[PDB]
Amino acid sequence: SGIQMENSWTISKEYHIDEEVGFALPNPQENLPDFYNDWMFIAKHLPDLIESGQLRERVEKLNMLSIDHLTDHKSQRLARLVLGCITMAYVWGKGHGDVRKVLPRNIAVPYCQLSKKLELPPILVYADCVLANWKKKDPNKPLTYENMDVLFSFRDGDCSKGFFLVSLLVEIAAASAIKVIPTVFKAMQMQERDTLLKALLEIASCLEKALQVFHQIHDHVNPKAFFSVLRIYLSGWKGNPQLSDGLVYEGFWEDPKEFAGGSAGQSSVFQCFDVLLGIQHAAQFLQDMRRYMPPAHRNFLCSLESNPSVREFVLSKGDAGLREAYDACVKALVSLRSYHLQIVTKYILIPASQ
Ligand SMILES: CC(C)(C)c1ccc(S(=O)(=O)N2C[C@H]3C[C@H]4C[C@H](C4(C)C)[C@@]3(COC(=O)Nc3ccc(I)cc3)C2)cc1
């Protein structure tokens, strides 16, 4: 394959894709070294600090903390999540138009240095607030909504736990499809009909499960709270009239810089299975959001594109079962796309109408 392999069964660890949670970060770090307690206090108290109007003054009194004591990937990912949440809270405040156009240097410099190390933009992205923003309540119990929590929220009542955790559980459901991908390509190389069929049916089954998990969003997110509260903190400064030149990262760049806020295009799940199934100004935007995924996940998506076409293989075999299994995967992925559009309508377009 174009996919680098660790062994005959498992893809390379260099893709940072976990067998159990997929593109999500496995067992995220929850605590930083004591050195960073001042950052953690602010992030853990964002709801009451934003609500009381205390957040900005608190950030402005922070001392400068070097990033050199964040020595491994998980601590760096946690620090990025912490600093990114503080940054969105600092820029947008309570979300009433009182924006800050300069991010103070004692956040901007460490945030930007950590972002450079991880090759992610210095703005909150999906890999922060969903893929790394979670824990198990009971380590001995499975990955279920009842047994999990987020690490950070923005405002009390913003429904961030529901929005982030349901998204994460969709990613985890997709993980059981991602781990079958090498089997698909081995089965094509070996001309193993049943192996390919069972792989495609498993992928379909897991993507169908992912849609069923996605349906839970309605039980844990209120449309008005999402649109009027949470959406503020997922908004960016690229083409935004409130920050028309972007944000000044004090002490890192002289001039303001534009970075985009959140997009569903930041989940690698869509492109992963679009490419696998051959069903790939919107192209430019799509590729830009790819640069907001972790670089290892970009590399996985690129390796997938270098592989033979599953679609053309299946459609050449005169094999109803293979085609039905392939069609079941296409249907499942299209249903995820359609549901995303339904969520955009109910949680953004309609509330905006009001
Ligand atoms: C407000 C905003 C435009 C960012 C958005 C709108 C609708 C949806 S969603 O509910 O349609 N859906 C959840 C996720 C569930 C399914 C559909 C994909 C999925 C395959 C995993 C979703 C991916 O989620 C995200 O990429 N989330 C995200 C991205 C950046 C940030 I910073 C924070 C969160 C999409 C998600 C986000």
Q: Are 150 and 104 in contact (CB under 8 A)?
A: no
> Ligand 1 centroid to 221 CA: how many Å?
13
| Domains (range + CATH), the chain | 16-353 (1.20.58.480)
Ligand 1 atom 34: residue of nearest CA: 126
Residue 46 burial (10 A CB sphere; 0-12, 13-18, 19+):
buried
- 3-state helix, strand, coil split of the chain in percent (to 5) is 60, 5, 35
Name the closest-CA residue to atom 26, ligand 1: 264
**What's the per-residue H, E or C state across 242-262?**
HHCCCEEECCCCCCCECCCCC
CA atoms of 354 and 349, how far apart (whole Å): 9
If you ran DSSP here, which 8-state letter would residue 264 be given?
G
Which of 143, 93, 91 has the alpha carbon at shortest distance from 258? 91
Contact 79, 67 (CB under 8 A): yes
Q: Are the CB atoms for 214 and 171 separated by under 8 Å?
A: no
* All residues at 6 or more sequence positions from 309 whose CB lies less than 8 Å from its CB, including other chains: 278
* Residue in this structure with the two tokens 């210095």, named with its chain if needed: 122
Residue 181 and residue 1 in contact, taking contact as beta carbons nearer than 8 Å:
no
The label of the residue with tokens 């985890």 reads: 172
Distance, in Å, from the CA atom of 199 to the CA atom of 187, rounded to the nearest integer, reads 9
**Atom number in ligand 1 closest to CA 267:** 26
Q: How far apart are CA 209 and CA 146, in angstroms?
A: 17
Residues annotated within a binding site for heme b: 340
Q: Which residues line ligand 1 (CB under 6 A)?
A: 124-126, 129-130, 167, 170-171, 214, 217, 231, 234, 262-264, 266-267, 269, 336, 340, 343-344
d(CA 80, CA 86): 10
- CA dist 230 and 151 (Å) reads 15
Are the C-beta atoms of residues 86 and 46 closer than 8 Å to each other?
yes
Cα(175)–Cα(20) distance, integer angstroms: 6
* 112, 152 Cβ separation under 8 angstroms: no
Question: What's the 30 CA to ligand 1 centre distance in angstroms?
Answer: 23
- Solved using: X-ray
CA 45/CA 37 separation, integer angstroms? 12
Q: Count the alpha carbons within 13 Å of 322 in the hemisphere toward its beta carbon.
A: 20
Cα 323 from Cα 184, distance rounded (Å): 14
Mode of pairing for the β-strands spanning 248-249 and 148-149: unpaired
With beta carbons less than 8 A apart as the criterion, state whether 64 and 28 touch: no
Instruction: Determine the atom of ligand 1 nearest the C-alpha atom of 226.
Output: 1
Compute the distance between CA of residue 152 and CA of residue 40 in angstroms, rounded to an integer: 10
